[PDB]
Design a protein around this motif. Sequence first.
Motif, mmCIF file in Angstrom:
data_model
loop_
_atom_site.group_PDB
_atom_site.id
_atom_site.type_symbol
_atom_site.label_atom_id
_atom_site.label_comp_id
_atom_site.label_asym_id
_atom_site.label_seq_id
_atom_site.Cartn_x
_atom_site.Cartn_y
_atom_site.Cartn_z
ATOM 1 N N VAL A 112 2.709 39.493 20.713
ATOM 2 C CA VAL A 112 3.321 39.733 22.016
ATOM 3 C C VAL A 112 4.729 40.259 21.748
ATOM 4 O O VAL A 112 5.664 39.479 21.531
ATOM 5 C CB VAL A 112 3.375 38.432 22.855
ATOM 6 N N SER A 163 -0.913 24.195 9.281
ATOM 7 C CA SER A 163 -2.008 24.592 10.186
ATOM 8 C C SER A 163 -1.714 25.815 11.064
ATOM 9 O O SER A 163 -2.588 26.275 11.780
ATOM 10 C CB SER A 163 -2.385 23.418 11.091
ATOM 11 N N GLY A 164 -0.496 26.351 11.028
ATOM 12 C CA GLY A 164 -0.208 27.542 11.803
ATOM 13 C C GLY A 164 1.253 27.899 11.795
ATOM 14 O O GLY A 164 2.104 27.041 11.543
ATOM 15 N N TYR A 165 1.540 29.173 12.057
ATOM 16 C CA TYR A 165 2.914 29.660 12.167
ATOM 17 C C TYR A 165 3.087 30.426 13.472
ATOM 18 O O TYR A 165 2.123 30.923 14.048
ATOM 19 C CB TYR A 165 3.258 30.593 10.984
ATOM 20 N N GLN A 166 4.337 30.515 13.921
ATOM 21 C CA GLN A 166 4.764 31.507 14.900
ATOM 22 C C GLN A 166 6.131 31.989 14.411
ATOM 23 O O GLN A 166 6.985 31.166 14.046
ATOM 24 C CB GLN A 166 4.897 30.915 16.313
ATOM 25 N N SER A 213 1.768 35.110 15.761
ATOM 26 C CA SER A 213 1.326 33.759 15.689
ATOM 27 C C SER A 213 -0.134 33.738 15.259
ATOM 28 O O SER A 213 -0.932 34.536 15.755
ATOM 29 C CB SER A 213 1.488 33.097 17.053
ATOM 30 N N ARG A 214 -0.451 32.841 14.328
ATOM 31 C CA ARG A 214 -1.844 32.560 13.910
ATOM 32 C C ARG A 214 -1.954 31.057 13.593
ATOM 33 O O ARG A 214 -1.040 30.479 13.002
ATOM 34 C CB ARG A 214 -2.223 33.404 12.685
ATOM 35 N N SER A 215 -3.058 30.426 13.981
ATOM 36 C CA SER A 215 -3.226 28.991 13.755
ATOM 37 C C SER A 215 -4.677 28.547 13.808
ATOM 38 O O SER A 215 -5.516 29.236 14.367
ATOM 39 C CB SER A 215 -2.444 28.182 14.790
ATOM 40 N N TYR A 216 -4.946 27.387 13.222
ATOM 41 C CA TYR A 216 -6.264 26.752 13.314
ATOM 42 C C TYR A 216 -6.343 25.876 14.563
ATOM 43 O O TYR A 216 -5.347 25.295 14.994
ATOM 44 C CB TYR A 216 -6.536 25.903 12.068
ATOM 45 N N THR A 217 -7.532 25.791 15.153
ATOM 46 C CA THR A 217 -7.721 25.016 16.382
ATOM 47 C C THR A 217 -8.559 23.742 16.188
ATOM 48 O O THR A 217 -8.364 22.744 16.907
ATOM 49 C CB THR A 217 -8.367 25.889 17.482
ATOM 50 N N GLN A 257 -2.234 35.900 17.659
ATOM 51 C CA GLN A 257 -1.605 36.519 18.809
ATOM 52 C C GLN A 257 -0.417 37.389 18.422
ATOM 53 O O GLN A 257 0.250 37.129 17.428
ATOM 54 C CB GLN A 257 -1.163 35.431 19.783
ATOM 55 N N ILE A 313 -6.994 31.343 15.514
ATOM 56 C CA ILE A 313 -6.686 32.259 16.596
ATOM 57 C C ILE A 313 -5.373 32.944 16.271
ATOM 58 O O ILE A 313 -4.526 32.364 15.609
ATOM 59 C CB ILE A 313 -6.587 31.555 17.955
ATOM 60 N N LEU A 361 -8.644 21.051 14.329
ATOM 61 C CA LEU A 361 -7.764 20.367 13.394
ATOM 62 C C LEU A 361 -8.456 19.196 12.707
ATOM 63 O O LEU A 361 -8.194 18.935 11.539
ATOM 64 C CB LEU A 361 -6.461 19.922 14.089
#
Lengths: 156, 168
Positions: B81, B33-36, B92-96, B79, B77, B98
């Motif tokens: 930085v 559902s997302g990585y950073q 970072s990109r991920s689903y909110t 991000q 979403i 869920l």
Amino acid sequence: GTTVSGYINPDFVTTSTTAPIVKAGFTVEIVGTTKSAVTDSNGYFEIKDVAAGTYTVKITKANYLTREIANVSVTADKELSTSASPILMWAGDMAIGGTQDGAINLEDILEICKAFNTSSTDAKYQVGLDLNRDGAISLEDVMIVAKHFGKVSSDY
Amino acid sequence: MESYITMNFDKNTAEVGQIIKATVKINKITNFSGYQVNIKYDPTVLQAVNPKTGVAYTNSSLPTSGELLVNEDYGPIVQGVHKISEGILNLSRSYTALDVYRASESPEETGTVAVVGFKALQKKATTVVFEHSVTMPNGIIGTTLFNWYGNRITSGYSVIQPGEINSE
Ligand SMILES: [Ca+2]
Ligand SMILES: [Ca+2]
């Protein structure tokens, strides 16, 4: 009269270092009385001298979605929850403009993202946005909010 | 581990001014559902740029989307930085949404998640790696992946670093 007790835990995974900070500080009120208690580092609360009767129990904490538990029937000493099966509280209804709105949505996410990718030594870091209190504001904090995205207090 | 996250280059050589596309890819990450990710490069040798346009990254520039994490129904979403002077990117990109994602019964588990560009400032041997950051307390070699229950994936995948650029 009686003692009403139990356990509150936040709904996210903790460690030995973070648990005692995040499990403490939940205020549990027996609505209709002026009786309350704050959870200790084990998430445990105890309210004494409660009169027999049926109540709504309300649980609050800064940056958590307020919970109400209806039809709590008290006839003697009562345990509302246990350490293995606690009442869960959902982090991520954030204080924005000095007030929470009782919904977990995009604005709550955006509030955290104001200090995204910071650790506690950074000036931009705010401990309140570090939901899991691991000393960083990272994707973990954002995903905690996403667990209950689009929810309100009546969804508990 | 045949489950992994890695970075792949479209090419590993580059004349001054040419752009290498660096693609972050995952393989068999269950209910992803997302990585950073936190990436270290040498800013005197490589310049972080948009992989399509060549525009220099600033410290808030966003990673270009890949195959995964682009279903608008799950509310992605994204991000960025960075500290471009130190050669550090954090993406970072991920689903909110869920619960919506789970309801589809269609997890994204393998494919591309991000693309960044690197323009050669010098033709000189240089290394790009995923790197630990204090901003990511439980990072696995500078990576944190999540499942569709909103939990961090704490084990079971490899972090495969890319090959060298302009080795000779
Ligand atoms: Ca809110
Ligand atoms: Ca945190």
